[PDB]
Design a protein around this ligand. Structure first.
Ligand SMILES: [Cl-]
Ligand SMILES: [Co+2]
Length: 129
């Protein structure tokens, strides 16, 4: 599913991401925009052989099992394919673990490089939450 901006903001709010670990909703919407272009089906291979999955581009080396990443730790205890669903629940639940891991949203390179320090409130402007 390709989400609209406000549609995704509303879904993320319903799933408890607004101000989760102190990160306002706009941060999450911005991260999703630049990680996946709001497409739940996005996948991208990495040089290390791992793959990133779904709207928040969660990695198979640490977080989910894709059956082809040797030594994967599967810390979210889910198949990576679950992260490609139109229902964002599994992605959100896993993202909450990632952001709690010590480095906050710096875990997402696109967030660090494209969202951090910017006016992230713009990403939810106009939306009826
Ligand atoms: Cl933090
Ligand atoms: Co990535």
């Amino acid at each position: 599913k390709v989400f609209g901006r406000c549609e995704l903001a509303a879904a993320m709010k319903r799933h408890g991401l607004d101000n989760y670990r102190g990160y306002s909703l706009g941060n999450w919407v911005c991260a999703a925009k630049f990680e996946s272009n709001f497409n739940t089906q996005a996948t991208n291979r990495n040089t290390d052989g791992s793959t990133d999955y779904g709207i928040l581009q969660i990695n198979s080396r640490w977080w989910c099992n894709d059956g082809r990443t040797p030594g994967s730790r599967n810390l979210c205890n889910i198949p990576c394919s679950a992260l490609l669903s139109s229902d964002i629940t599994a992605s959100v639940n896993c993202a909450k673990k990632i952001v709690s891991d010590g480095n906050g949203m710096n875990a997402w390179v696109a967030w660090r490089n494209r969202c951090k320090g910017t006016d992230v409130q713009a990403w939810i402007r106009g939306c009826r939450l």
